[model samples]
Target: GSHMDLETLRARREAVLSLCARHGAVRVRVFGSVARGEAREDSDLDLLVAFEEGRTLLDHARLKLALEGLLGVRVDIVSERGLAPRLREQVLREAIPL
Candidate 1:
Protein backbone atom coordinates (compact mmCIF):
# COMPACT_ATOMS: atom_id res chain seq x y z
CA GLY A 1 0.00 0.00 0.00
CA SER A 2 2.59 2.50 1.15
CA HIS A 3 -0.29 4.82 1.88
CA MET A 4 0.54 8.20 3.25
CA ASP A 5 -0.10 9.29 6.81
CA LEU A 6 -3.11 11.38 7.77
CA GLU A 7 -1.26 14.67 7.59
CA THR A 8 0.15 13.76 4.22
CA LEU A 9 -3.24 12.65 3.05
CA ARG A 10 -4.74 15.98 4.05
CA ALA A 11 -2.02 17.93 2.31
CA ARG A 12 -2.30 15.86 -0.83
CA ARG A 13 -6.06 16.17 -0.77
CA GLU A 14 -5.77 19.94 -0.63
CA ALA A 15 -3.26 19.92 -3.46
CA VAL A 16 -5.53 17.77 -5.61
CA LEU A 17 -8.57 19.94 -4.91
CA SER A 18 -6.63 23.06 -5.81
CA LEU A 19 -5.33 21.44 -8.97
CA CYS A 20 -8.81 20.29 -9.94
CA ALA A 21 -10.24 23.73 -9.34
CA ARG A 22 -7.59 25.29 -11.52
CA HIS A 23 -8.01 22.68 -14.25
CA GLY A 24 -11.80 22.98 -14.54
CA ALA A 25 -12.70 19.70 -12.87
CA VAL A 26 -16.45 19.71 -12.27
CA ARG A 27 -16.16 17.18 -9.47
CA VAL A 28 -13.65 15.02 -7.62
CA ARG A 29 -14.21 12.07 -5.33
CA VAL A 30 -12.03 9.73 -3.32
CA PHE A 31 -13.05 6.10 -3.34
CA GLY A 32 -11.82 2.64 -2.26
CA SER A 33 -9.89 2.14 0.95
CA VAL A 34 -9.07 5.78 1.54
CA ALA A 35 -12.68 6.81 1.38
CA ARG A 36 -13.69 3.87 3.52
CA GLY A 37 -11.12 4.68 6.22
CA GLU A 38 -9.62 1.27 5.75
CA ALA A 39 -6.40 2.04 3.97
CA ARG A 40 -3.37 -0.13 4.59
CA GLU A 41 0.24 1.04 4.43
CA ASP A 42 0.42 -0.05 0.81
CA SER A 43 -2.97 0.96 -0.50
CA ASP A 44 -3.11 3.11 -3.57
CA LEU A 45 -5.34 6.08 -3.94
CA ASP A 46 -8.52 5.72 -5.97
CA LEU A 47 -10.10 8.80 -7.45
CA LEU A 48 -13.08 9.57 -9.63
CA VAL A 49 -12.79 12.77 -11.58
CA ALA A 50 -15.21 14.66 -13.77
CA PHE A 51 -14.01 17.59 -15.74
CA GLU A 52 -15.70 20.46 -17.52
CA GLU A 53 -16.73 19.87 -21.12
CA GLY A 54 -13.48 21.09 -22.63
CA ARG A 55 -11.06 18.88 -20.72
CA THR A 56 -9.06 16.23 -22.56
CA LEU A 57 -7.27 12.95 -21.93
CA LEU A 58 -3.95 14.72 -21.61
CA ASP A 59 -5.42 16.95 -18.96
CA HIS A 60 -6.59 13.93 -17.06
CA ALA A 61 -3.18 12.31 -17.35
CA ARG A 62 -1.48 15.44 -16.10
CA LEU A 63 -3.81 15.68 -13.15
CA LYS A 64 -3.27 12.06 -12.27
CA LEU A 65 0.49 12.40 -12.45
CA ALA A 66 0.41 15.54 -10.36
CA LEU A 67 -1.66 13.86 -7.70
CA GLU A 68 0.61 10.80 -7.65
CA GLY A 69 3.64 13.02 -7.27
CA LEU A 70 2.04 15.08 -4.55
CA LEU A 71 0.96 12.06 -2.58
CA GLY A 72 3.96 9.88 -3.31
CA VAL A 73 1.61 7.03 -4.10
CA ARG A 74 0.06 5.30 -7.03
CA VAL A 75 -3.23 6.82 -8.13
CA ASP A 76 -6.02 5.12 -10.02
CA ILE A 77 -8.24 7.62 -11.78
CA VAL A 78 -11.67 6.81 -13.14
CA SER A 79 -13.24 9.31 -15.48
CA GLU A 80 -16.72 9.98 -14.22
CA ARG A 81 -17.90 11.07 -17.65
CA GLY A 82 -16.89 7.75 -19.19
CA LEU A 83 -17.44 5.35 -16.32
CA ALA A 84 -19.33 2.14 -16.88
CA PRO A 85 -22.74 2.14 -15.26
CA ARG A 86 -22.07 -0.62 -12.74
CA LEU A 87 -18.68 0.70 -11.72
CA ARG A 88 -20.03 4.22 -11.59
CA GLU A 89 -22.79 3.10 -9.32
CA GLN A 90 -20.32 1.32 -7.07
CA VAL A 91 -18.14 4.39 -6.90
CA LEU A 92 -21.07 6.64 -6.18
CA ARG A 93 -22.05 4.36 -3.35
CA GLU A 94 -18.58 4.34 -1.80
CA ALA A 95 -16.91 7.59 -2.71
CA ILE A 96 -16.43 10.76 -0.72
CA PRO A 97 -16.21 14.16 -2.37
CA LEU A 98 -13.09 16.21 -2.14
Candidate 2:
Protein backbone atom coordinates (compact mmCIF):
# COMPACT_ATOMS: atom_id res chain seq x y z
CA GLY A 1 0.00 0.00 0.00
CA SER A 2 1.03 3.57 -0.57
CA HIS A 3 0.38 6.81 1.17
CA MET A 4 -2.30 8.46 -0.90
CA ASP A 5 -4.56 11.41 -0.60
CA LEU A 6 -6.55 12.84 -3.46
CA GLU A 7 -3.73 15.12 -4.52
CA THR A 8 -1.04 12.45 -4.56
CA LEU A 9 -3.34 10.02 -6.35
CA ARG A 10 -4.07 12.54 -9.06
CA ALA A 11 -0.41 13.37 -9.44
CA ARG A 12 0.61 9.76 -9.64
CA ARG A 13 -2.06 9.02 -12.20
CA GLU A 14 -0.84 11.85 -14.36
CA ALA A 15 2.74 10.62 -14.05
CA VAL A 16 1.68 7.16 -15.08
CA LEU A 17 -0.17 8.51 -18.10
CA SER A 18 2.88 10.44 -19.13
CA LEU A 19 5.06 7.38 -18.76
CA CYS A 20 2.69 5.40 -20.95
CA ALA A 21 2.63 8.13 -23.55
CA ARG A 22 6.41 8.16 -23.66
CA HIS A 23 6.40 4.43 -24.24
CA GLY A 24 4.08 4.94 -27.23
CA ALA A 25 1.06 3.29 -25.76
CA VAL A 26 -1.80 3.28 -28.24
CA ARG A 27 -4.26 3.50 -25.38
CA VAL A 28 -4.08 3.72 -21.60
CA ARG A 29 -6.85 3.51 -19.07
CA VAL A 30 -7.32 3.46 -15.33
CA PHE A 31 -9.89 1.02 -14.14
CA GLY A 32 -11.19 -0.75 -11.00
CA SER A 33 -11.71 1.18 -7.76
CA VAL A 34 -9.55 4.11 -8.78
CA ALA A 35 -11.56 4.84 -11.90
CA ARG A 36 -14.80 4.06 -10.09
CA GLY A 37 -14.03 6.69 -7.45
CA GLU A 38 -14.15 4.17 -4.66
CA ALA A 39 -10.52 3.42 -4.06
CA ARG A 40 -9.40 2.67 -0.56
CA GLU A 41 -5.98 3.72 0.71
CA ASP A 42 -4.57 0.25 0.23
CA SER A 43 -5.91 -0.35 -3.24
CA ASP A 44 -3.53 -0.92 -6.09
CA LEU A 45 -3.67 1.06 -9.30
CA ASP A 46 -5.12 -1.01 -12.11
CA LEU A 47 -4.07 0.00 -15.60
CA LEU A 48 -5.11 -1.30 -18.97
CA VAL A 49 -2.62 -0.57 -21.72
CA ALA A 50 -2.66 -1.20 -25.43
CA PHE A 51 0.51 -0.80 -27.43
CA GLU A 52 1.27 -0.77 -31.10
CA GLU A 53 2.65 -3.92 -32.68
CA GLY A 54 6.20 -4.89 -31.64
CA ARG A 55 5.85 -4.14 -27.95
CA THR A 56 6.94 -7.20 -26.02
CA LEU A 57 6.09 -8.68 -22.63
CA LEU A 58 9.45 -7.39 -21.45
CA ASP A 59 8.38 -3.90 -22.33
CA HIS A 60 5.21 -4.32 -20.28
CA ALA A 61 7.15 -5.64 -17.31
CA ARG A 62 9.51 -2.73 -17.42
CA LEU A 63 6.63 -0.29 -17.56
CA LYS A 64 4.92 -1.90 -14.63
CA LEU A 65 8.05 -1.63 -12.54
CA ALA A 66 8.57 1.95 -13.58
CA LEU A 67 5.06 2.84 -12.59
CA GLU A 68 5.42 1.20 -9.21
CA GLY A 69 8.71 2.95 -8.63
CA LEU A 70 7.22 6.29 -9.57
CA LEU A 71 4.17 5.88 -7.37
CA GLY A 72 5.81 3.90 -4.57
CA VAL A 73 2.99 1.40 -4.74
CA ARG A 74 1.97 -1.78 -6.46
CA VAL A 75 0.61 -1.52 -9.99
CA ASP A 76 -1.52 -4.02 -11.83
CA ILE A 77 -1.19 -3.99 -15.59
CA VAL A 78 -3.47 -5.62 -18.13
CA SER A 79 -1.98 -5.88 -21.57
CA GLU A 80 -4.21 -5.71 -24.63
CA ARG A 81 -2.22 -8.60 -26.03
CA GLY A 82 -3.84 -11.92 -25.19
CA LEU A 83 -6.46 -10.31 -23.01
CA ALA A 84 -9.47 -12.46 -22.20
CA PRO A 85 -12.67 -11.30 -23.83
CA ARG A 86 -14.69 -10.82 -20.66
CA LEU A 87 -11.98 -8.91 -18.86
CA ARG A 88 -11.25 -6.77 -21.87
CA GLU A 89 -14.91 -5.93 -22.16
CA GLN A 90 -15.03 -4.98 -18.52
CA VAL A 91 -12.07 -2.70 -18.86
CA LEU A 92 -13.56 -1.05 -21.95
CA ARG A 93 -16.83 -0.51 -20.13
CA GLU A 94 -15.47 0.87 -16.88
CA ALA A 95 -12.05 2.30 -17.51
CA ILE A 96 -11.19 5.98 -17.76
CA PRO A 97 -8.91 6.89 -20.62
CA LEU A 98 -5.81 8.91 -19.85
Candidate 3:
Protein backbone atom coordinates (compact mmCIF):
# COMPACT_ATOMS: atom_id res chain seq x y z
CA GLY A 1 0.00 0.00 0.00
CA SER A 2 3.02 2.27 -0.18
CA HIS A 3 3.92 2.25 -3.82
CA MET A 4 3.35 4.69 -6.65
CA ASP A 5 1.35 2.53 -9.00
CA LEU A 6 -1.42 2.64 -11.58
CA GLU A 7 -4.27 1.92 -9.24
CA THR A 8 -3.28 4.63 -6.83
CA LEU A 9 -2.76 7.12 -9.61
CA ARG A 10 -5.99 6.15 -11.29
CA ALA A 11 -7.97 6.82 -8.14
CA ARG A 12 -6.22 10.10 -7.53
CA ARG A 13 -6.64 10.97 -11.20
CA GLU A 14 -10.36 10.31 -11.00
CA ALA A 15 -10.70 12.65 -8.08
CA VAL A 16 -8.70 15.25 -9.95
CA LEU A 17 -10.74 14.80 -13.12
CA SER A 18 -13.99 15.14 -11.25
CA LEU A 19 -12.77 18.34 -9.71
CA CYS A 20 -11.76 19.67 -13.10
CA ALA A 21 -15.09 18.75 -14.63
CA ARG A 22 -16.88 20.67 -11.92
CA HIS A 23 -15.25 23.79 -13.29
CA GLY A 24 -16.38 23.30 -16.93
CA ALA A 25 -13.25 21.66 -18.24
CA VAL A 26 -14.11 19.77 -21.41
CA ARG A 27 -11.45 17.12 -20.95
CA VAL A 28 -8.60 16.00 -18.68
CA ARG A 29 -5.64 13.73 -19.33
CA VAL A 30 -2.76 12.52 -17.16
CA PHE A 31 0.69 12.51 -18.68
CA GLY A 32 4.42 12.44 -17.88
CA SER A 33 5.84 9.87 -15.43
CA VAL A 34 2.52 8.66 -14.09
CA ALA A 35 1.10 8.23 -17.56
CA ARG A 36 4.23 6.37 -18.61
CA GLY A 37 3.99 3.95 -15.70
CA GLU A 38 7.22 5.04 -14.08
CA ALA A 39 6.18 7.31 -11.27
CA ARG A 40 7.85 7.71 -7.89
CA GLU A 41 6.24 8.85 -4.65
CA ASP A 42 7.11 12.45 -5.36
CA SER A 43 6.05 12.51 -8.98
CA ASP A 44 3.94 15.53 -9.71
CA LEU A 45 0.58 15.06 -11.34
CA ASP A 46 0.75 16.41 -14.91
CA LEU A 47 -2.67 17.18 -16.27
CA LEU A 48 -3.86 18.42 -19.66
CA VAL A 49 -7.08 20.40 -19.57
CA ALA A 50 -9.36 21.22 -22.49
CA PHE A 51 -11.92 23.84 -21.68
CA GLU A 52 -14.61 25.36 -23.83
CA GLU A 53 -12.88 27.69 -26.29
CA GLY A 54 -13.93 30.93 -24.65
CA ARG A 55 -13.10 30.19 -21.05
CA THR A 56 -10.87 32.85 -19.54
CA LEU A 57 -7.41 32.28 -18.08
CA LEU A 58 -8.76 33.43 -14.74
CA ASP A 59 -11.25 30.57 -14.84
CA HIS A 60 -8.44 28.08 -15.22
CA ALA A 61 -6.42 29.67 -12.49
CA ARG A 62 -9.41 29.44 -10.22
CA LEU A 63 -9.80 25.75 -11.07
CA LYS A 64 -6.17 25.11 -10.27
CA LEU A 65 -6.56 26.86 -6.95
CA ALA A 66 -9.59 24.79 -6.08
CA LEU A 67 -8.00 21.48 -7.01
CA GLU A 68 -4.82 22.19 -5.09
CA GLY A 69 -6.86 23.28 -2.12
CA LEU A 70 -8.90 20.07 -2.06
CA LEU A 71 -6.18 17.59 -2.98
CA GLY A 72 -3.31 19.08 -1.02
CA VAL A 73 -0.95 18.48 -3.93
CA ARG A 74 0.64 20.50 -6.68
CA VAL A 75 -1.00 20.12 -10.07
CA ASP A 76 0.05 21.10 -13.57
CA ILE A 77 -2.86 22.19 -15.73
CA VAL A 78 -2.62 23.08 -19.42
CA SER A 79 -5.22 23.75 -22.04
CA GLU A 80 -5.67 21.27 -24.90
CA ARG A 81 -4.68 23.97 -27.35
CA GLY A 82 -1.62 24.61 -25.22
CA LEU A 83 -0.73 20.92 -25.37
CA ALA A 84 -1.64 20.34 -29.03
CA PRO A 85 1.89 20.56 -30.33
CA ARG A 86 3.04 17.82 -28.00
CA LEU A 87 0.06 15.68 -28.86
CA ARG A 88 0.62 16.25 -32.56
CA GLU A 89 4.28 15.42 -32.13
CA GLN A 90 3.39 12.24 -30.31
CA VAL A 91 5.77 13.04 -27.49
CA LEU A 92 3.54 10.75 -25.37
CA ARG A 93 -0.15 9.97 -25.09
CA GLU A 94 -2.95 8.70 -22.84
CA ALA A 95 -6.77 8.75 -22.71
CA ILE A 96 -8.70 11.02 -20.40
CA PRO A 97 -11.64 9.85 -18.36
CA LEU A 98 -14.92 10.51 -20.15
- Please name the candidate that would achieve the greatest TM-score relative to the true structure: 1
**Candidate 1 residue-wise lDDT at 91:** 86
lDDT of 3 at 54: 66
Model 3, span 1-98: residue lDDT tens? 34545765566567667777767686676656556666556767666677885688877888888766655566667777677775834523564453
Q: Whole-model Cα lDDT per candidate? A: 0.77, 0.76, 0.66
Question: What clash pairs does model 2 have?
Answer: none
- Sort by lDDT, best first: 1, 2, 3
Candidate closest to the true structure, highest lDDT: 1
Q: Considering TM-score, which of the candidate structures 1 and 3 is the better prediction for this target?
A: 1
User: Please, what is the TM-score per model?
Assistant: 0.84, 0.83, 0.68
Collision pairs in model 3: none
Which parts of model 1 are misplaced by more than 4 Å? 1-3
Per residue, candidate 1 scores C-alpha lDDT tens digits across 2-44 of: 5367666877788788897676665677777778776776666
Candidate 3 all-Cα RMSD: 3.3
